[PDB]
Amino acid sequence: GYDRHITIFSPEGRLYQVEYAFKATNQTNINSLAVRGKDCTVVISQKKVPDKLLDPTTVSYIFCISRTIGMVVNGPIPDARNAALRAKAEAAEFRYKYGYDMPCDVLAKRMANLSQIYTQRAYMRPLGVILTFVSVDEELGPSIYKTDPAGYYVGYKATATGPKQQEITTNLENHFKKSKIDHINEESWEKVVEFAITHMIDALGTEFSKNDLEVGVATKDKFFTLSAENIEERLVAIAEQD
Amino acid sequence: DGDTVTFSPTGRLFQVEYALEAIKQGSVTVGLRSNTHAVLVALKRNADELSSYQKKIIKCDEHMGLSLAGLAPDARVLSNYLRQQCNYSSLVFNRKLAVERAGHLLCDKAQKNTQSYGGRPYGVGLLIIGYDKSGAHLLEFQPSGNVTELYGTAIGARSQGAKTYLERTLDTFIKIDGNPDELIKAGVEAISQSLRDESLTVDNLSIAIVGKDTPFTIYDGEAVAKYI
Amino acid sequence: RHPLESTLKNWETTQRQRQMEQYRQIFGIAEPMKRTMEMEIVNRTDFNPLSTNGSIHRDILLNKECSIDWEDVYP
Amino acid sequence: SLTTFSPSGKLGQIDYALTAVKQGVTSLGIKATNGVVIATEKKSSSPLAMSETLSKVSLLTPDIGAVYSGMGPDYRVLVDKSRKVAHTSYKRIYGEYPPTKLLVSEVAKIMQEATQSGGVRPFGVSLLIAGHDEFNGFSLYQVDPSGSYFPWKATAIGKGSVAAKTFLEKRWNDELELEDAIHIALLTLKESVEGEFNGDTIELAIIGDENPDLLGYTGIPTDKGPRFRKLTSQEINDRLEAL
Amino acid sequence: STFSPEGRLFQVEYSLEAIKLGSTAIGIATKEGVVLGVEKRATSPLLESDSIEKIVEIDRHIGCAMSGLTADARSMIEHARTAAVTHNLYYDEDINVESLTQSVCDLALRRLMSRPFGVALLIAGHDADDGYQLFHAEPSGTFYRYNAKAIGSGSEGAQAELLNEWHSSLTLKEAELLVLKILKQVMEEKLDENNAQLSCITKQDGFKIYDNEKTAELIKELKEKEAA
Amino acid sequence: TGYDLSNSVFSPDGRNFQVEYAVKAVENGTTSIGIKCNDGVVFAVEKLITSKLLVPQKNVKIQVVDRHIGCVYSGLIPDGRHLVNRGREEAASFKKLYKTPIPIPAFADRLGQYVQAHTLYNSVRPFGVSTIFGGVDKNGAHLYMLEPSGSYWGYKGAATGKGRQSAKAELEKLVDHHPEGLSAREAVKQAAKIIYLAHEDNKEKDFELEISWCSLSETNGLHKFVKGDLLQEAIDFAQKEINGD
Amino acid sequence: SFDNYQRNNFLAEQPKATSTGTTIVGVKFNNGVVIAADTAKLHRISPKIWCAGAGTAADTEAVTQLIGSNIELHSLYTSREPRVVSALQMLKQHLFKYQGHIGAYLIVAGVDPTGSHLFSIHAHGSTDVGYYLSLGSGSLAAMAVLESHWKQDLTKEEAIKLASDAIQAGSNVDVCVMEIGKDAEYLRNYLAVLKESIV
Amino acid sequence: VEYALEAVKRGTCAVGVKGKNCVVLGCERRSTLKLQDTRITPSKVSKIDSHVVLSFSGLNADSRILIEKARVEAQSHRLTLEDPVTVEYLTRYVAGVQQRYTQSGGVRPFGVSTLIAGFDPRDDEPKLYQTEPSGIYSSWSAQTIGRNSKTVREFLEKNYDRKEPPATVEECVKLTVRSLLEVVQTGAKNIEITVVKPDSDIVALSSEEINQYVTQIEQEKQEQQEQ
Amino acid sequence: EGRLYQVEYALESISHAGTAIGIMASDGIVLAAERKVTSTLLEQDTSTEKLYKLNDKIAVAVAGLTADAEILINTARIHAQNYLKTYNEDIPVEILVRRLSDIKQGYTQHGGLRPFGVSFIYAGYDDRYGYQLYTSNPSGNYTGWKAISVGANTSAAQTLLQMDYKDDMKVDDAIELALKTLSKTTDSSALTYDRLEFATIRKGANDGEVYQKIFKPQEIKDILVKTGIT
């Protein structure tokens, strides 16, 4: 019936233009992972370049929002780019309103509350995207926050996303079951990238030729993404470990 | 569907396909251009032998011209708009619109009514003619906002004959300059070819002509006895 | 007449109009149009004669969700 | 449906918004003779996901707290508008934070304004609001999607609400001090709980007499400072030793 | 507002089919002036004149008559009156009639694709630019010039004799007894100053509506002419 | 099924159907191509002729965008005219304000977002038209392709329209024998071969092909059309090539 | 808000407002910041951000409790403590919005998770910062007092003794001290017709 | 528009007649519902100004807002000109608002028909106008609206000639009570009537005075039986 | 058809809302509303359920969505006090019920809004017409009455009013007939003092002003001990 077409409750309390925005999060078949060290928070994406004449330098799912803060997206690239342009406008205004740099927690709340608008208006579409933030915050250390099409928002110690996400997350849980810490027990951002990829390759089984990586790294002064030779050092170090 | 912005299962726009069906309802008009002048001939309609035959030539400060091949009111909205678009360009700057942007402005303004939810596009084929900082121009406009500078063309119901004639005789007009003479008569033969069994007369037929040192002068008046 | 009159009465929208001008110059034609089209389907759809407050989701698009003006205690 | 009437005078869309409330992870509150309690179950996801950022329970005025069942984003915007109302309609005219009655009237209006306006579905949350008025005392209200609000001696909303109000109708009587209400409320969410029962799967917070130690300054005896307290996981794990 | 498979608006066509069962208004132009006339139908003998006047003045130079709900066009007629007299108040001239006919029939376009004034309309009057002029106007945007034209149930059937029975040199009284001959043609009735109403529109009269007494000397003149 | 009727409605698999029905308009429009070059950028466009009545001098199907940027498109063409028109002021205002030309990545996002903003609300339809555009800035030569969804990605070489499937065998089979790509002169020549050869599917229509380029060395960093001696040389190159079969 | 304007100009052609013309200090110290005023001029923006005010008293009480409302909502919207630079930004935006037509002269001093800070807002929304400031008309003597007897890292006791001296220069004082680990400290005055009815 | 006029055909019978120097209006009114109070009850017939009246049939809720809109207009017209609004100008506005609320989707039409009447200063012609959901204004010398108005309109059109307006308020009132008594099988306590004489002499008729007319017609009808 | 289907269903809506009565006297007015079947844990003096006070001299006995009614009640307060500030003199009950009953048609006029699902029995006093009793319903019509009911079982209540009501009776006589009516139209197996609300209007303490008390639950016991059962 007509209830399925717009953000209006159906007979069992459901919002189908939010549920069909969850199936939109799968469209790329990308999977992604983000993890904290003692000093860093680091985020990983699969990559797929179907065309033989496509540029891999531009199949980008990792975004710097502003100096110390960034995110990864699961769902279609146009809705993902729209999220990244909201998020930079949220953070740029917060330094105007309040005299300090936007914390990841408040940005993940602030984006999750805009998602409450489209989730209530009958005459708007939700975005089809799940977000995951990275930053280093002086109030809390390195941090991760989720967001989804409903505006559900939650802070994380380490997280993974995509159509394979229960497998990546099941093997992350069974690491902290042993270390019993809130972060991967290492100091350099390089060590935690190499751990994250050790769990990414273990999880997703299709051994990563370097094109299947895109990675961002957040640290106290900067969030940045790995250059095509910086990725190569991680890959050689994991190849040297075993 | 009848929806004004929505796309069909095969990628089609039924609202604009039916804006072009108004070409299969408006009475014929035809036009062409040369090195120095350009011409259009409009053939008219009536309700009864008594009725006065329909007006279908206008101008923009004797700088441009226009005709209609469907709903005259919709072409009149584009006529008054372009006529004021050429009125503000003249008076504010002491310049003139060279015809280049007339095609663009129509093609912006007609696409918008398929773009927004709102009232439908201007439901009519239009032919605009003018003279520039360099040369005479003919623009055919088509609904949803296409402009084409066609060297000759015909629009309205069954107008395939007059196109065929402007193509079939590339002499007599393309090469003709200085005095306007054969432009009028050759265009008039192409429309006069097109009518199946109907008639041509001294009120029923009217010609737009534009170009170098012709301030656009409307020819439906008794001076047309020189050209029937 | 008073030097602050009209200047403060229109401050709410005039600052928002100028903020949309920064959205133009920093992010192109897309973002101000996207937001001003959100402004038109959020402000014009609030049909409720007994409710003159405006709209709750307007502050979720206006940055007034967690702040006060004298104009908001002195309506 | 746009909340227009059905063929027997039902609002249609509000009964489905009540079903969004009915599906939520439980919260409950109790009026006690010297204070009021607000109680709720958290969930989040794996040990990857914290349950300890912006809490499910939250402070509206120094003397009022709130908790919910249903769609979290709806509740979260209702409470952050509700905080703004308390300052811009009461505190900046009257110098006093609004008593529970007025701030509940304002939350009730935002919910009613959704069961009638253009382009909008009802909010999918029921809000329990509880707090202290100097004149009419320690108080508990339920606010539903419909905008209607009922005051109570005790109440529960969401998944566990039928069991929790069946228990509270068998239990609550006009002699209970704050602490034995907590010992019934713990035993009540000990029967809402789908997961493990512990000091991070349960939120629990209170209004009692004030704590000048939480005013963050001293020297003006006049001010009493916070009436409302967010219990820490340690303060909760002490009481969870007795249950 | 909506399109059909064939180029034409449903919100216009599915309205206009009402006036095809409306009051049979008829007008005639001549060398000496214009005539305009109607079936003077009333809901009861209890209805006074000076109420639903099915023929009206616009100014001393111009009148109107119509076939659907007059109150709809009465709104357009408020603007027709005020726009005409404000031209004269500003510029000291009667607006030349065709330019009033466009300006008053352009209300049915309000700036696009509009819900119709469900009523076709007969402006008629004098100027020195094109003489005594009889028009037609619509929920679209249209014209006529100077001849006979008709609206309402009998009108196109009457039009088959109106085209036949006319010429340029006629004097007004010729059109007066000619407008009564036609107005009887399909009404199943005796026309009189209760079932028909008339006006003559001239440089000597202005627009004027025949008084019930003058409607009894002109019907007497047709009735004695029946022996011819 | 039955979700198809408006712009801002996901159907049961989460698809926006007005991406799925807008891209069908791109297919049945013009087929055309472009290539990224070691020194520059190339565009090559099928100016299809259905009757000789045109002014072929002024039926320009590639569009100049900036002093160093250009553009080309397929679908309901009136859509793409608008994208270019305020594309010109978007770049020229950036140039007036920034005192330097707009980078191609910086242009590609603003345009991708103007298209994407019409895929959100149901008060507007999609732009039905795919686009290919590019130019030269201080970071290099760049080329992008855009689709009605607002999806856009950077490209080595790209093609569109009904010829796309056999064009997706001349593409690939360029770079599979040219992993360096080309300097722009052999890209101009090779490109003309492709679109000639792509006529294999269709009989009884005619065309002229027009080409354009910008480079660090093939022009001083300005967009220019390729016609004349070099295009006749490029057509002469291509002419025998489908005639090799 | 502007009402009853254009009429008072004629009625004047007016009660005086209760301006505080007195003098106030802030001094930055070994473990926090001190402020004081020569008294009730020590308004709270928040438990750890305090304002010593001067000029029109009603303006100082009204704006500090408006910014304190913004900041109370802010602490509830972020789940974090507020900062002296947050109050300084909001007083700059807010007093710029009211163009010095709201007439307050206003110290801001406080402690937050980043550190201890000390700023002042003049009527135009203009800002100063430093290790010490003095404001309200007695301050020209306190310029010399604070510049002379302050040194790197006075502790509580010497900052309170220096505050006593600075305000004494230019017989009684209110002082409050914000110490970086602790509750902020407030100190007051530290130094024959008849007729009848029931109604 | 068509369903809307069935709102009028669901509303109370309202009727009137011109006279040589008056207009009389009246309505079938359902008396009082056992426990209703007349002083606390609105009349059906309603004053717009001291020289202008409006009566009606159909949505009484819409008729409050239609009369309330007419009342603000009639005073605004008076304020803006000191022209105590002529009945033909009061009718223009009220017909105009029924046009305004026909034309759009959203703000659906007033489900009401009216008799509007009055006397301009020194215009001893009784101006009577009838309006409907579309915003017509047919004038009438006499007319019927509401339900059962068949036999009312038939009986009136058999008892009045447009060129025969009774001068005397006696016959003016006598005709209309006979007319309503065809419909009101519920008995003639249910009727209400009101008269305009020129120069602001609008006058209501009491429950006793209409009886000296019900028990004047009744024995006239019995004399017509004995004849 | 000449009907509105949302509005007939809004009238069907107030027909679900529990029974409410109001009866006038030769010197005063009474209100008497039923609270339907209710949970043991509900509060009983803090719960604003059926009756309210709109200025010094006017009350209301409502049936509907209480949430809808609250906004109209607030607008009656605002309008009444703004009238009292405008004319320095009390607002008549009829002007007030006209203003609120306009709003309830002004939404019914429209497709962009649902109409308010609220009926309103008003009691009040003024120096226009003395004591006035009004009744108003979801379409926005209003009517004066001597004795009236709204909400569920309105008809069964008016059958109990019809024959028993005698035009001259005093306030304290009407306090009987309200409970004779409600108990015969009871929506519960039986009454208890906490299940009903009452409010009254009387001519000052004696002359001058107006007296306008709301009964607290003990005062409700005090009127039930009388006209009760054995």
Side-chain angles (χ1 to χ4, degrees), chain B residues 3 5-11 13 100 107-108 111 114-117 144-147 149-152 163 167, chain F residues 4-6 18 21-22 24-25 52-55 58 76 78-79 81-82 85 118 122-128:
Chain B
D3 287 337
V5 317
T6 302
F7 296 176
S8 173
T10 51
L13 302 92
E100 181 72 45
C107 294
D108 173 69
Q111 184 264 7
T114 74
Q115 186 87 312
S116 304
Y117 181 75
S144 192
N146 301 55
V147 59
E149 309 206 332
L150 292 179
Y151 232 126
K163 280 185 176 184
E167 182 178 16
Chain F
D4 316 52
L5 295 311
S6 70
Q18 297 218 137
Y21 294 170
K24 281 188 179 292
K52 68 185 69 80
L53 291 173
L54 277 57
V55 184
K58 290 281 289 181
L76 179 60
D79 289 355
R81 300 179 189 276
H82 196 197
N85 280 350
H118 294 74
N122 58 0
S123 58
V124 297
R125 63 157 178 100
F127 284 70

Side-chain angles (χ1 to χ4, degrees), chain A residues 26-51 53-69:
Chain A
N26 290 185
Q27 275 209 329
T28 59
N29 216 284
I30 286 169
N31 303 270
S32 56
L33 163 69
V35 291
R36 299 193 307 152
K38 207 170 303 295
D39 178 56
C40 65
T41 182
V42 166
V43 57
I44 321 296
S45 182
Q46 281 194 299
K47 222 172 186 169
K48 183 178 179 180
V49 184
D51 299 0
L53 314 310
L54 251 175
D55 202 8
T57 321
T58 72
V59 186
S60 186
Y61 287 81
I62 306 294
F63 305 81
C64 78
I65 302 312
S66 279
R67 181 174 179 146
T68 61
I69 181 157

Side-chain angles (χ1 to χ4, degrees), chain D residues 134-149:
Chain D
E134 294 199 357
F135 290 82
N136 307 275
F138 295 117
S139 63
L140 172 68
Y141 291 96
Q142 174 174 344
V143 196
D144 286 344
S146 188
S148 59
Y149 59 96

Side-chain angles (χ1 to χ4, degrees), chain A residues 81-82 84-90 93 96-98 109-110 113-118 120-121 123-124, chain C residues 15 19 23 27 31 34-35 38 41-43 45-46 55-57 59-66:
Chain A
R81 283 179 177 136
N82 188 35
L85 268 165
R86 288 183 187 151
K88 183 166 180 172
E90 301 322 309
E93 184 165 39
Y96 193 76
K97 299 296 183 181
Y98 306 139
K109 169 172 185 158
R110 187 64 180 86
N113 283 15
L114 286 164
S115 307
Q116 194 275 346
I117 308 183
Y118 323 96
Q120 191 158 119
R121 293 309 183 192
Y123 309 148
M124 295 184 176
Chain C
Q15 186 176 1
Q19 183 173 42
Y23 276 110
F27 296 147
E31 194 68 3
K34 185 192 304 167
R35 290 182 181 284
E38 216 142 65
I41 199 166
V42 149
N43 169 62
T45 319
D46 312 308
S55 171
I56 191 165
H57 308 267
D59 291 2
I60 312 175
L61 297 167
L62 177 63
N63 323 113
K64 263 49 167 67
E65 59 218 300
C66 297

Side-chain angles (χ1 to χ4, degrees), chain E residues 38 40 176-177 180 190-199 208-223:
Chain E
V38 76
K40 191 194 182 175
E176 298 280 53
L177 238 67
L180 280 161
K190 177 56 170 58
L191 86 176
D192 64 355
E193 65 268 30
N194 309 289
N195 297 327
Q197 183 175 11
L198 302 171
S199 66
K208 78 178 295 294
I209 324 100
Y210 261 147
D211 173 60
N212 286 297
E213 173 273 356
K214 204 59 66 191
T215 303
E217 99 173 7
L218 264 291
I219 290 176
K220 173 53 165 51
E221 183 157 35
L222 181 59
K223 182 59 180 170

